[PDB]
C-alpha cells in the first residue's frame, strides 16, 4: 500500500473556567495536520484559520439559522454535557500512592538520587516537596514531570540530588486535591 | 479550566473513522463504529450516563464527505507521515514478583494507523493485553496506549514493537528489570 493518505478531524471543544461560570465553545476543522476553519463562541461566527478554509466560513456564515444554534451550544451542548459527567470527571478523586527510595544502591558517602514516587492519582494537579531533616530542599530537584497513564490516573517521579549520610531523615511531602492534609513519607539514610 | 472535546476523524483511503469524547486529556468514551455501540472508558461512567451511538455514524458520514471535498480543494495534498515517539513504563514502582502493568505510550504521530505488539523474550504476547483508541493532541497528532499486566522478574525482557508509515522499520521499545 503506497497510496497517499488524507485526514479530516473535527473537534468540538467546550472550555470551562471557574465552574461553568465562563464557557467557550471552539469548533475546529483540521485537514491533515492543519486547522482550516473554526467557530469560536467568543467571536460568534466561523472564521477561516487558513485561506483553504475560507469557502466554508463563508458558506456556513450565510446561514444565520445555523449560527444561532452554534451560539446557543455553549448552553445546550457544553453546559449540558458538563453536568452529565461532572460527578465522575470534575469530581473524580484518586489518592496517590507515595513511596521513597534511593534510585540505586550506592557506596557510603556517594552521591545518589532519592526518588519520591507518586502514582495512581487523579486529577493531575499535584505538588511534591523534599525535606532534609525538616528543612525544605529546593535545589537539585529533577523530575519526570506529570505522566498521564491513559486510564484516568497520573504518575510522576520527583528526585532529589543528595549524598545520603547516616542519621539524616528525608521527607517527601505531597499535596493533592484528594487529601485535605499533605501526605508525608520519610526515608532514613 | 476543564476541557471536554468531541473529537471525530475520517481517514482515506483506509476508510477509518472514529468518534470519542475527551476530558482533560482522558477518554470518556468512544463509539464502536462496526458494532454501533457506546464504549465507556471506565465501566462506572456507563452507569452514570448514556449516549446514543447512532448519532456518531451519521457524523462520521458527514466527515467522510467533507474529507473528500477538502482533499480535492487542496489539490490532493496528502498527509505527511509523522513517526511516533514511543515510551514504555510501569504504572508503579516495580517490586520483584509483585503484580504490575507495562504501559506502551505511543505519542505525537499521524496518520492514526499503527501496528503494535507486546513481546516477552521476543515472543508475541496476545492475552491479558488491552489498548485505547486514538486520542487527540493539541498539535493535531495522535496518542495511543497499550497495556500489559505482568509479574516482575529478573528472567524476562519486554518490548513494545510499533510499526508506522513514518518509520523506516519496526520500532522496539525495551523494558526489563535491572
Amino acid at each position: 500500500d503506497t497510496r497517499p493518505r488524507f485526514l479530516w478531524q473535527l473537534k468540538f471543544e467546550c472550555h470551562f473556567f471557574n465552574g461553568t461560570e465562563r464557557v467557550r465553545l471552539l469548533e475546529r476543522c483540521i485537514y491533515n495536520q492543519e486547522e482550516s476553519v473554526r467557530f469560536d463562541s467568543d467571536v460568534g461566527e466561523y472564521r477561516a484559520v487558513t485561506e483553504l478554509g475560507r469557502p466554508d466560513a463563508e458558506y456556513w456564515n450565510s446561514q444565520k439559522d445555523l449560527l444561532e444554534q452554534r451560539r446557543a451550544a455553549v448552553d445546550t451542548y457544553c453546559r449540558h454535557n458538563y453536568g452529565v459527567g461532572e460527578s465522575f470527571t470534575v469530581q473524580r478523586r484518586v489518592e496517590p500512592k507515595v513511596t521513597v527510595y534511593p534510585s540505586k544502591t550506592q557506596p557510603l558517602q556517594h552521591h545518589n538520587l532519592l526518588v519520591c514516587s507518586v502514582s495512581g492519582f487523579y486529577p493531575g494537579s499535584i505538588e511534591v516537596r523534599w525535606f532534609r531533616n525538616g528543612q525544605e530542599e529546593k535545589a537539585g530537584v529533577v523530575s519526570t514531570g506529570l505522566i498521564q497513564n491513559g486510564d484516568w490516573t497520573f504518575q510522576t517521579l520527583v528526585m532529589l540530588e543528595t549524598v545520603p549520610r547516616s542519621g539524616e531523615v528525608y521527607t517527601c511531602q505531597v499535596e493533592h486535591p484528594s487529601v485535605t492534609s499533605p501526605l508525608t513519607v520519610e526515608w532514613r539514610a | 479550566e476543564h476541557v471536554i472535546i468531541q473529537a471525530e476523524f475520517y481517514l482515506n483511503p483506509d476508510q477509518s473513522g472514529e468518534f470519542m469524547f475527551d476530558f482533560d486529556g482522558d477518554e470518556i468514551f468512544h463509539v464502536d463504529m462496526a458494532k454501533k455501540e457506546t464504549v465507556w472508558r471506565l465501566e462506572e461512567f456507563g452507569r452514570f450516563a448514556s449516549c446514543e451511538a447512532q448519532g456518531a455514524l451519521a457524523n462520521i458520514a458527514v466527515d467522510k464527505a467533507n474529507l473528500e471535498i477538502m482533499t480535492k480543494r487542496s489539490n490532493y495534498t496528502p498527509i505527511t507521515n509523522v513517526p511516533p515517539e514511543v515510551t514504555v513504563l510501569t504504572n508503579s514502582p516495580v517490586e520483584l514478583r509483585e503484580p504490575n502493568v507495562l504501559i506502551c505510550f505511543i505519542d505525537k504521530f499521524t496518520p492514526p494507523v499503527v501496528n503494535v505488539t507486546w513481546l516477552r523474550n521476543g515472543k508475541p504476547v496476545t492475552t491479558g493485553v488491552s489498548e485505547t483508541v486514538f486520542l487527540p493532541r493539541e498539535d493535531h497528532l495522535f496518542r495511543k496506549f497499550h497495556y500489559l499486566p505482568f509479574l516482575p522478574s529478573t528472567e524476562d525482557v519486554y518490548d513494545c514493537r510499533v510499526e508506522h508509515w513514518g518509520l523506516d522499520e519496526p520500532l522496539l521499545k525495551h523494558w526489563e528489570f535491572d
Binding site: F12, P55, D56, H80, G83 | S50, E52, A58, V62, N66
Partner: peptide, 14 residues
Amino acid sequence: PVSKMRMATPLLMQ
C-alpha cells in the same frame, strides 16, 4: 436528556 451526553452535529460543505 439530563443524564445523556449530547452530540454536536458537523456542518456539510458546499
